[PDB]
Design a protein around this motif. Structure first.
Motif, PDB file in Angstrom:
ATOM      1  N   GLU A   1       5.716   4.154   0.127  1.00  0.00           N
ATOM      2  CA  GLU A   1       6.429   5.426   0.132  1.00  0.00           C
ATOM      3  C   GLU A   1       7.738   5.291   0.900  1.00  0.00           C
ATOM      4  O   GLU A   1       8.773   5.804   0.465  1.00  0.00           O
ATOM      5  CB  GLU A   1       5.544   6.521   0.736  1.00  0.00           C
TER       6      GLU A   1
ATOM      7  N   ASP B   1      -3.896   9.185   0.857  1.00  0.00           N
ATOM      8  CA  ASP B   1      -2.610   8.783   1.423  1.00  0.00           C
ATOM      9  C   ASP B   1      -2.007   9.867   2.309  1.00  0.00           C
ATOM     10  O   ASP B   1      -1.355   9.557   3.312  1.00  0.00           O
ATOM     11  CB  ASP B   1      -1.641   8.418   0.300  1.00  0.00           C
TER      12      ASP B   1
ATOM     13  N   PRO C   1      -5.512   5.851   6.363  1.00  0.00           N
ATOM     14  CA  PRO C   1      -4.932   5.976   5.022  1.00  0.00           C
ATOM     15  C   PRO C   1      -4.218   4.696   4.617  1.00  0.00           C
ATOM     16  O   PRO C   1      -3.540   4.059   5.425  1.00  0.00           O
ATOM     17  CB  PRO C   1      -3.951   7.139   5.179  1.00  0.00           C
ATOM     18  N   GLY C   2      -4.372   4.323   3.352  1.00  0.00           N
ATOM     19  CA  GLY C   2      -3.636   3.193   2.837  1.00  0.00           C
ATOM     20  C   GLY C   2      -4.140   1.820   3.213  1.00  0.00           C
ATOM     21  O   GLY C   2      -3.415   0.846   3.013  1.00  0.00           O
ATOM     22  N   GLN C   3      -5.333   1.696   3.774  1.00  0.00           N
ATOM     23  CA  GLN C   3      -5.808   0.399   4.228  1.00  0.00           C
ATOM     24  C   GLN C   3      -6.693  -0.208   3.152  1.00  0.00           C
ATOM     25  O   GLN C   3      -7.497   0.494   2.531  1.00  0.00           O
ATOM     26  CB  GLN C   3      -6.589   0.524   5.538  1.00  0.00           C
ATOM     27  N   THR C   4      -6.546  -1.511   2.925  1.00  0.00           N
ATOM     28  CA  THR C   4      -7.422  -2.206   1.996  1.00  0.00           C
ATOM     29  C   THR C   4      -8.533  -2.856   2.807  1.00  0.00           C
ATOM     30  O   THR C   4      -8.282  -3.745   3.627  1.00  0.00           O
ATOM     31  CB  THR C   4      -6.660  -3.250   1.180  1.00  0.00           C
TER      32      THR C   4
ATOM     33  N   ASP D   1       0.834  -1.180   0.000  1.00  0.00           N
ATOM     34  CA  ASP D   1       0.000   0.000   0.000  1.00  0.00           C
ATOM     35  C   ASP D   1       0.883   1.250   0.000  1.00  0.00           C
ATOM     36  O   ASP D   1       2.033   1.179   0.431  1.00  0.00           O
ATOM     37  CB  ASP D   1      -0.907  -0.061   1.225  1.00  0.00           C
ATOM     38  N   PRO D   2       0.356   2.409  -0.421  1.00  0.00           N
ATOM     39  CA  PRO D   2       1.196   3.644  -0.545  1.00  0.00           C
ATOM     40  C   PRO D   2       1.862   4.135   0.742  1.00  0.00           C
ATOM     41  O   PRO D   2       2.958   4.701   0.629  1.00  0.00           O
ATOM     42  CB  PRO D   2       0.221   4.681  -1.134  1.00  0.00           C
ATOM     43  N   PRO D   3       1.252   4.045   1.954  1.00  0.00           N
ATOM     44  CA  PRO D   3       2.006   4.480   3.155  1.00  0.00           C
ATOM     45  C   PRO D   3       3.313   3.744   3.420  1.00  0.00           C
ATOM     46  O   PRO D   3       4.300   4.384   3.801  1.00  0.00           O
ATOM     47  CB  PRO D   3       1.007   4.247   4.292  1.00  0.00           C
ATOM     48  N   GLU D   4       3.358   2.427   3.230  1.00  0.00           N
ATOM     49  CA  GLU D   4       4.623   1.716   3.371  1.00  0.00           C
ATOM     50  C   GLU D   4       5.412   1.666   2.070  1.00  0.00           C
ATOM     51  O   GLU D   4       6.652   1.574   2.113  1.00  0.00           O
ATOM     52  CB  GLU D   4       4.385   0.307   3.924  1.00  0.00           C
TER      53      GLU D   4
END
Lengths: 49, 49
Positions: free
Chosen positions: A47, B27, B12-15, A42-45
């Motif tokens: 990044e 994000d 943010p960023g959670q599926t 996912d984008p937070p990790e």
């Protein structure tokens, strides 16, 4: 006899090779491939990686 | 109002199914998420649908 000129050519090629080689370094990340990092995370990790 | 286990998904960023199809966070989101139990008011014995 012509060692000096060849040495300069060798250094330039070697430097480029090292720089290309550096693309294959994880640098403390899970993978060295950006596409894999985007695909798997996912984008937070992603990044952070 | 969401499930007990879905509070993690409001980030943010959670599926999550609600994350993908109901409420989506960006994000770069800034702010605070507040979650509290609402069994006393938002539940019924026959089933609150």
């Amino acid at each position: 006899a012509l060692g000096k000129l060849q040495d300069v050519v060798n250094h330039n090629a070697q430097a480029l090779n090292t720089l290309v080689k550096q693309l294959s370094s994880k640098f403390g990340a899970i993978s060295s491939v950006l596409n894999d990092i985007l695909s798997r995370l996912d984008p937070p990790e992603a990044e952070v990686q | 109002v969401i499930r007990g286990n879905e509070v993690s998904q409001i980030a943010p960023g959670q599926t999550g199914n609600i994350a993908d199809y109901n409420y989506k966070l960006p994000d770069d989101f800034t702010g605070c998420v507040i979650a509290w139990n609402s069994n006393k008011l938002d539940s019924k014995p026959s089933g609150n649908y």
